[PDB]
Amino acid sequence: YKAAGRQTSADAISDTGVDLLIDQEKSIDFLVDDIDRVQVAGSLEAYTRAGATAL
């Protein structure tokens, strides 16, 4: 304020910004064959849990 004589004038304010882009879209997609579902030793629902764990 002292170097300015004793003058003051008002500045314009401004902003910065960043974009959160929601640009990721990812998928799981697999077949459970009915012949395999019948012929295997037990439940295949562990593959639905594996798909969820992968995402």
Partner 1 sequence: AFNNFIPELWSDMLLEEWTAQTVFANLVNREYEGIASKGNVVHIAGVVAPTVKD
Contact positions vs partner 1 (CB under 8 A): 38-41
CB of 42 to partner 1, least distance (A): 9
Nearest to partner 1 of 40, 50 (CB atom): 40
CA pseudo-torsion sign 37, 42, 43, 49: negative
CB of 39 to partner 1, least distance (A): 5
Tokens of 31: 């077949």
- Cα separation of 40 and 34, whole Å? 10
CB of 48 to partner 1, least distance (A): 20
